[PDB]
Amino acid sequence: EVNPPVP
Amino acid sequence: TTIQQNKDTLSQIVVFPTGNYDKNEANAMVNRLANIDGKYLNALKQNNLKIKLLSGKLTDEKEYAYLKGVVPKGWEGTGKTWDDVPGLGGSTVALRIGFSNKGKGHDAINLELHATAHAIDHIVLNDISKSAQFKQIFAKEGRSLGNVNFLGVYPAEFFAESFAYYYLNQDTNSKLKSACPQTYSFLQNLAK
Numbered sequence: 422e423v424n425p426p427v428p
Numbered sequence: 429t430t431i432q433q434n435k436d437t438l439s440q441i442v443v444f445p446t447g448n449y450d451k452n453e454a455n456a457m458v459n460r461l462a463n464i465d466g467k468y469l470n471a472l473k474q475n476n477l478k479i480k481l482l483s484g485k486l487t488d489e490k491e492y493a494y495l496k497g498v499v500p501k502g503w504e505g506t507g508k509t510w511d512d513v514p515g516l517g518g519s520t521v522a523l524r525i526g527f528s529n530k531g532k533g534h535d536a537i538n539l540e541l542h543a544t545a546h547a548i549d550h551i552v553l554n555d556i557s558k559s560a561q562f563k564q565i566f567a568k569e570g571r572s573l574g575n576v577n578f579l580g581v582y583p584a585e586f587f588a589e590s591f592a593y594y595y596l597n598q599d600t601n602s603k604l605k606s607a608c609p610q611t612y613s614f615l616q617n618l619a620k
Binding site for chain 1: 495500502503506508510513514515518519534536546575578579585588589
């Protein structure tokens, strides 16, 4: 799984 | 001191890039990670989770090339893809040196703590951000930290950002306590 930071 | 121990634990988890990079800022990123409770860092070490610090784009790494041109979840409409995203967390952790601070291609309170929180959520805590307990806390307080179209919609993102607030420094820890008291108590008990 991958999660980005806050845009 | 516990911080020294945490820095030693991190010396077994952090991977520095080859070639030229900002060694001072990479050390600063590690020092900020050392504020995370040792229980989580030791569990990351035990699971051989590597925190990869990068001098280039995430998608230049072989393991993230499949994300080229892919718009991250919650980044719809920004016009950016993973190619432009400075950090990634989950089953792995990868971070661009120099992009820690809010506004450096992202609006997280701190890049490396937010990303590492995703790995702690997913690997160490078996996706506790999706648990019924956290979903009830997320339903009440998930729109109290700003960026409500992102933190207020994805509990894993609310968990990661709250985690980052809790551990970055005393100021952000206090802000979280005031804004999200149930989340704050949840994280406090999580570390016991």
